[PDB]
Amino acid sequence: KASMTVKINESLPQGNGKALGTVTVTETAYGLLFTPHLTGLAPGIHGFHLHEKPSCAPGMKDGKAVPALAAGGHLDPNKTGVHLGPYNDKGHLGDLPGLVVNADGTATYPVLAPRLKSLSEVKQHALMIHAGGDNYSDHPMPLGGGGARMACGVIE
């Protein structure tokens, strides 16, 4: 059973917020399954992506402090330069299905990302949770409308 764990922390302008729980990443016969064990999130569907750089630190953009900016953009080994979701080979390999958050603010619903096949593809990248949702497109809003980076955890 090739499975591993990722600690998730709140993402503040200053650094790291409280621990919001974990996410289990498991290899299946159909791809990587992300089983969340998170708490304290806004109910609804959240942008859920793997970002390039292994960091959840703040960065500077237009003079302001931006949560988890040091993580860079989306994991994109094919250099597609386009956000197209978990089921389309023509976009960022780091595109996972939206994270489903319950009414009590927890995340327990497992999401399969069929394109990822082994834990190695996930190591040394930032697992990102956004404020906004994800329609798996750059239209109408870029990167699925995720907007701000709200929670994060370096995988390794």
Q: Which two tokens stand for residue 37?
A: 């064990």
73 within 8 A of 52, measured Cβ to Cβ: yes
Give the whole-angstrom CA distance, residue 77 versus residue 117. Answer: 14
Window 63 to 122, contacts with a copy of itself (CB under 8 A):
86-87, 89, 97-98, 100, 102-103, 109-110, 112, 114-115
Q: Does 139 bind a copy of itself (CB under 8 A)?
A: no
Region from 23-31, 33-41, 56-64, 124-132 binding Zn ion, contact rule CB under 5 A: 124-132
Buried b (16+ CB within 10 A) or exposed e, 55-82: bbbbbeeeeeeebbbbbbebbbeeebeb
Contact 68, 148 (CB under 8 A): no
Residue 46 interacts with Zn ion (CB under 5 A): yes or no: no
One symbol per residue from 45 to 64: x for binding a copy of itself (CB under 8 A), - otherwise; what is it? x-------------------
Contacts to a copy of itself by CB under 8 A? 28-31, 33, 43-45, 86-87, 89, 97-98, 100, 102-103, 109-110, 112, 114-115
